Amino acid sequence: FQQLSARLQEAIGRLRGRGRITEEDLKATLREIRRALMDADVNLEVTRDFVERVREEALGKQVLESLTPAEVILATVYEALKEALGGEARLPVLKDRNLWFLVGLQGSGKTTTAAKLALYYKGKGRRPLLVAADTQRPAAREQLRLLGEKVGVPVLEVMDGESPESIRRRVEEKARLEARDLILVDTAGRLQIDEPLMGELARLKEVLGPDEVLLVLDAMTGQEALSVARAFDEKVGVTGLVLTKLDGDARGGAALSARHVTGKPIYFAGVSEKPEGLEPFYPERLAGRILGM
Numbered sequence: 001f002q003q004l005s006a007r008l009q010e011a012i013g014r015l016r017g018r019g020r021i022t023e024e025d026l027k028a029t030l031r032e033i034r035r036a037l038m039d040a041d042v043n044l045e046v047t048r049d050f051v052e053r054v055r056e057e058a059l060g061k062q063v064l065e066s067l068t069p070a071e072v073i074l075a076t077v078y079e080a081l082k083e084a085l086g087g088e089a090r091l092p093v094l095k096d097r098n099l100w101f102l103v104g105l106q107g108s109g110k111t112t113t114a115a116k117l118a119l120y121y122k123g124k125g126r127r128p129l130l131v132a133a134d135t136q137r138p139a140a141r142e143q144l145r146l147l148g149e150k151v152g153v154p155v156l157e158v159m160d161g162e163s164p165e166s167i168r169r170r171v172e173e174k175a176r177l178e179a180r181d182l183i184l185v186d187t188a189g190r191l192q193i194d195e196p197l198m199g200e201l202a203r204l205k206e207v208l209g210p211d212e213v214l215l216v217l218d219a220m221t222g223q224e225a226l227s228v229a230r231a232f233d234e235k236v237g238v239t240g241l242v243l244t245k246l247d248g249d250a251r252g253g254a255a256l257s258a259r260h261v262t263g264k265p266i267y268f269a270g271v272s273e274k275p276e277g278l279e280p281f282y283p284e285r286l287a288g289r290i291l292g293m
């Protein structure tokens with residue numbers, strides 16, 4: 001979000017040591033914030049509410065009567081950013097037995113996140129099992145098999161054209177025999193939504209009943225990323241989100257509009273291509289970081 005932070009810390013910086021600014025120094029800065037949000041590809045409705053929330057909250061803080069208005073703005077923009085990102089952190093509820101679907105498009109970081117998610121929980125005392133659920137592309141299963149060997153987590157590859165009921169049986173037996181307590185199913189990912197695959201997807205969810213359905217979204221595809229969320233949600237049912245490639249995220253509209261566009265919380269974030277690159281999402285932390293704090 002290099003760009004956004006830079007210009008945002010600027011607009012704020014453009015107020016220090018000025019004393020009590022008027023409703024014209026303000027009006028100036030707010031638009032600046034609005035333009036910053038736009039050049040970051042933030043949803044236009046989010047951008048509107050955001051700017052409004054800053055006008056509203058700042059006046060409530062008598063910015064016009066403050067002797068340090070830059071600290072008020074910084075403060076309201078901070079909360080506006082924390083809210084937009086999701087507010088307080090959120091992590092799936094870890095039960096005794098967990099079966100989660102990782103869904104998304106090919107290249108979203110979905111296969112890699114399934115293996116990072118496994119690695120993450122393994123270090124948390126969980127006993128995961130990776131499941132490569134693509135019944136049409138051996139290579140896709142193969143990719144997860146290698147990813148799994150590298151993070152030291154077992155991988156079950158479904159068979160070509162294998163039925164959900166079959167998959168269920170095999171996964172549960174391996175889970176049983178290996179005391180797996182966190183099951184991660186990397187579903188089929190394609191360059192674009194496939195109606196038939198969506199059907200096989202919903203069906204698979206129907207047979208296996210995951211407690212969580214996490215949609216993996218590449219943060220670098222801006223506003224587009226979220227347009228794919230409504231389809232998955234509609235035809236399958238998403239419980240949370242994972243925003244990958246935040247470390248390559250120039251701009252940042254995706255992450256900032258996600259909670260508004262999707263209505264789902266971001267549990268995890270991809271912050272490096274490294275195995276440990278995946279971490280729980282902290283809206284508060286990301287907000288403070290954007291404002292340089």
Ligand SMILES: Nc1nc2c(ncn2[C@@H]2O[C@H](COP(=O)(O)OP(=O)(O)O)[C@@H](O)[C@H]2O)c(=O)[nH]1
Nearest residue numbers: 106107108109110111112244245270271272273
């Ligand atoms: N820098 C960075 N790279 C990532 C992140 N998540 C995934 N990747 C990389 O993005 C590419 C796409 O991953 P994935 O969708 O799993 O693979 P594909 O389906 O085979 O294209 C891989 O090269 C991953 O290493 C992330 O958070 N940061």
